[PDB]
Amino acid sequence: GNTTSSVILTNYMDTQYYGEIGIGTPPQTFKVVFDTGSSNVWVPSSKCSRLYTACVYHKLFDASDSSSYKHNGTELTLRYSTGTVSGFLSQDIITVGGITVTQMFGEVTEMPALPFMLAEFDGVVGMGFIEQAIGRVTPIFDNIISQGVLKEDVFSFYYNRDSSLGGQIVLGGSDPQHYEGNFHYINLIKTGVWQIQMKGVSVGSSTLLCEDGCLALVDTGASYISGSTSSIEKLMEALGAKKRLFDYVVKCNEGPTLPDISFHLGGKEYTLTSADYVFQESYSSKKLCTLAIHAMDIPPPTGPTWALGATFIRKFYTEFDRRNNRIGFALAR
Numbered sequence: 630g631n632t633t634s635s636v637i638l639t640n641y642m643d644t645q646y647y648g649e650i651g652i653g654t655p656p657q658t659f660k661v662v663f664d665t666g667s668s669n670v671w672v673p674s675s676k677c678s679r680l681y682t683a684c685v686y687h688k689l690f691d692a693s694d695s696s697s698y699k700h701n702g703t704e705l706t707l708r709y710s711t712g713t714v715s716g717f718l719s720q721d722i723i724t725v726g727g728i729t730v731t732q733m734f735g736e737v738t739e740m741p742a743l744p745f746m747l748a749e750f751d752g753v754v755g756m757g758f759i760e761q762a763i764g765r766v767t768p769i770f771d772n773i774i775s776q777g778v779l780k781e782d783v784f785s786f787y788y789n790r791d792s793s794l795g796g797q798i799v800l801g802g803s804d805p806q807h808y809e810g811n812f813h814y815i816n817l818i819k820t821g822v823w824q825i826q827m828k829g830v831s832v833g834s835s836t837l838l839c840e841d842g843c844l845a846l847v848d849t850g851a852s853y854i855s856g857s858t859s860s861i862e863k864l865m866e867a868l869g870a871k872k873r874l875f876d877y878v879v880k881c882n883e884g885p886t887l888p889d890i891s892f893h894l895g896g897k898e899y900t901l902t903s904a905d906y907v908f909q910e911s912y913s914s915k916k917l918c919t920l921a922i923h924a925m926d927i928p929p930p931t932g933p934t935w936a937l938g939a940t941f942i943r944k945f946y947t948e949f950d951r952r953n954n955r956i957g958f959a960l961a962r
């Protein structure tokens with residue numbers, strides 16, 4: 630076809646990038662993360678008990694105020710790298726950047742506070758494959774694609790640095806005014822998942838890890854670049870960072886000196902300069918700066934896998950190809 634679309638996203642501390650969709654006729658407006666790490670849509674429900682503090686803090690979906698809603702009813706529990714939300718199915722029309730589809734989503738009535746009370750966004754839009762869709766529910770992209778409207782079965786993400794535009798997705802294409810040089814594609818390893826083959830991580834100058842080929846799931850819904858606890862740990866040893874419970878960190882003076890890390894994808898090497906990965910809010914001997922890499926163990930469903938999140942997409946404009954099943958990288962401008 631010939632439509633092309635984008636949503637515009639807001640960047641929050643570089644750690645959380647959301648855009649907005651509208652469910653229901655009259656629209657209910659919710660804020661959401663467009664995640665390629667999963668494949669289901671959910672937003673909080675009015676039915677959620679406000680004994681859950683998260684619900685008192687996020688907009689909820691009232692469907693009895695929606696003329697288009699449509700009852701469903703099966704339960705559905707979503708598990709993620711880092712939190713579960715439980716709830717039930719339903720349908721109404723959703724509007725993502727001017728394209729309206731009728732999608733089956735989940736109304737969550739169980740939303741745990743941690744980490745939910747810390748999320749600026751209301752829910753999630755999985756841009757994953759049918760395959761990873763819990764409930765075996767068709768996802769937004771496949772439905773949009775059914776409409777016959779895009780010129781291409783492709784969506785791309787721009788994540789900006791921070792403090793105009795926070796980001797931008799474009800459905801049915803790629804804005805050439807946010808990339809440079811050529812795109813470079815990596816074919817999808819199995820299908821029904823955004824996983825690509827990853828050839829080795831270099832810290833500084835040598836493959837400290839990844840060495841016999843590994844998995845890198847490219848995931849827009851994640852904020853940091855992460856790996857198994859076990860290679861994380863190692864990499865960390867190298868760089869010379871500590872643990873803080875959840876994130877490593879280095880002393881700020883040290884900061885603008887940690888070597889570069891590289892990611893070996895398709896004969897090309899994606900290097901991240903030290904600034905790209907440290908969150909430098911100081912340069913002082915006495916203060917701790919944390920890094921934008923983590924440990925995350927994603928289980929055999931798909932993991933173990935390294936996840937390349939926002940840290941990475943923000944440097945390399947990413948296009949995800951449906952028509953052809955692969956992922957291409959280009960340099961963000």
Ligand SMILES: CCCCNC(=O)[C@H](C)C[C@H](O)[C@@H](N)C[C@H](Cc1ccc(OC)c(OCCCOC)c1)C(C)C
Nearest residue numbers: 644645646662666667708709710744748753849850851
């Ligand atoms: C159902 C199978 C799940 C498959 N995918 C995964 O497990 C991924 C590795 C992790 C998820 O994609 C995860 N990032 C999604 C995300 C989890 C999450 C929870 C709390 C957060 O805030 C403290 C958060 O921050 C996300 C920031 C994204 O901004 C771009 C993400 C929401 C949408 C559920």
